[PDB]
């Protein structure tokens, strides 16, 4: 599914994610819009042979089992196909435990260079929340 701005912004408040962790909805929206331009089938191979899954490009060296990572973990238990569902409900769980894991956002490549210290406000204006 490729989602919409506020129709993205409304199912992540839902879930559980405005203001997780200190993080307001507005840095969840735009993390996804340049990780995966909203599409929750979005993958990405990288060089060292890990795939990156979903609407918020989940790594499977470290996060989702897709049996062919060879020495990696599996730390949110899921098969990295559950992170490609039109129900974000196994993305938005994960995304909870890796920006827990200490350097918070800055875990998102592209949230680093393209959303931190920006106005994130932004990316939820005009939305029914
Ligand atoms: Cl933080
Ligand atoms: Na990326
Ligand atoms: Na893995």
């Known amino acids: 599914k490729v989602f919409?701005?506020?129709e993205l912004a409304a199912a992540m408040k839902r879930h559980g994610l405005d203001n997780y962790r200190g993080?307001?909805?507005?840095?969840?929206?735009?993390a996804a819009k340049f990780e995966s331009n909203f599409?929750?089938?979005?993958?990405?191979?990288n060089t060292d042979?890990?795939?990156?899954?979903?609407?918020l490009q989940i790594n499977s060296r470290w996060w989702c089992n897709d049996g062919r990572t060879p020495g990696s973990r599996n730390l949110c238990?899921?098969?990295?196909?559950?992170?490609?569902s039109?129900?974000?409900?196994?993305?938005?769980?994960?995304?909870?435990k890796i920006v827990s894991?200490?350097?918070?956002?800055?875990?998102?490549?592209?949230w680093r260079n393209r959303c931190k210290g920006t106005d994130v406000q932004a990316w939820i204006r005009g939305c029914r929340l």
Not at 23 to 30: D, K, Q
Not at 49 to 55: E, K, L, P, R
């Open 101 to 110: 894991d200490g350097n918070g956002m800055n875990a998102w490549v592209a």
């Open 86 to 96: 039109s129900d974000i409900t196994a993305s938005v769980n994960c995304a909870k």
């Open 23 to 30: 993080y307001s909805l507005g840095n969840w929206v735009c």
């Open 39 to 45: 599409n929750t089938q979005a993958t990405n191979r």
């Open 4 to 6: 919409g701005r506020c």
């Open 77 to 84: 238990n899921i098969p990295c196909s559950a992170l490609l």
């Open 49 to 55: 042979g890990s795939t990156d899954y979903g609407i």
